[PDB]
Scaffold this active site. Structure first.
Site, mmCIF file in Angstrom:
data_model
loop_
_atom_site.group_PDB
_atom_site.id
_atom_site.type_symbol
_atom_site.label_atom_id
_atom_site.label_comp_id
_atom_site.label_asym_id
_atom_site.label_seq_id
_atom_site.Cartn_x
_atom_site.Cartn_y
_atom_site.Cartn_z
ATOM 1 N N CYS A 112 40.226 75.477 52.936
ATOM 2 C CA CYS A 112 39.789 76.844 53.213
ATOM 3 C C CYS A 112 40.557 77.902 52.418
ATOM 4 O O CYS A 112 41.685 78.238 52.746
ATOM 5 C CB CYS A 112 39.842 77.100 54.724
ATOM 6 N N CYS A 158 42.144 80.931 54.284
ATOM 7 C CA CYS A 158 43.337 80.541 55.042
ATOM 8 C C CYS A 158 44.576 80.580 54.172
ATOM 9 O O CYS A 158 45.632 81.022 54.621
ATOM 10 C CB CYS A 158 43.188 79.142 55.643
#
Lengths: 102, 103
Positions: B30, B33
């Site tokens: 991700c 993130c």
């Protein structure tokens, strides 16, 4: 985080602090607004360094003298002279710059 | 300086041995993130009233399924062992706001 409103105030802060970082921002610049909270945050932990902000249009005189091309720009000053300068709004990049000096 | 939690037992332990815990549900696949990681680590240094932990959603499947995590990243805060506030997405300004609400 002090926003500097004049040349005089810029010249003054830079000259009587051994370590100063300046974030050259502008309200018309999205990336600047993105990274502001992180900058605010670092100024809290890295207390060995003075954190200031300059709005590039607000203090034109300083931007043209400090020769700013892209937005944002972070410049650090040691003993009143430009030492390192980082272009763009990346968190880890800005962290790395600050730690280099505190 | 931000504990990565690697087991549900450890997740449970921290949540229950601590008054205020914020958790960053991340994963290495991700991008968002990864972007917000440095801000989270920084915040952990200053907002000391609160324990910051990270959990990798795939490493600790059992936790992510129980905590019902849909979007990535997710930040939850726990007060006295219960889930109390939860923020979706990787926004510095927003994450600051969530942390400030508790320290």
């Amino acid at each position: 985080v002090k926003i500097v409103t004049s040349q005089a105030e810029f010249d003054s802060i830079i000259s009587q602090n051994e370590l100063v970082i300046v974030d050259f921002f502008a309200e018309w610049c999205g990336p600047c607004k993105r990274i502001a909270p992180f900058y605010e945050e670092c100024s809290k932990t890295y207390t060995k360094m003075v954190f200031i902000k300059v709005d590039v249009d607000e203090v034109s005189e300083v931007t043209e003298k400090e020769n700013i091309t892209s937005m944002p720009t972070f410049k650090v000053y040691k003993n009143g002279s430009s030492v390192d300068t980082l272009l763009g709004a990346n968190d880890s990049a800005l962290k790395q710059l600050i730690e280099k000096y505190a």
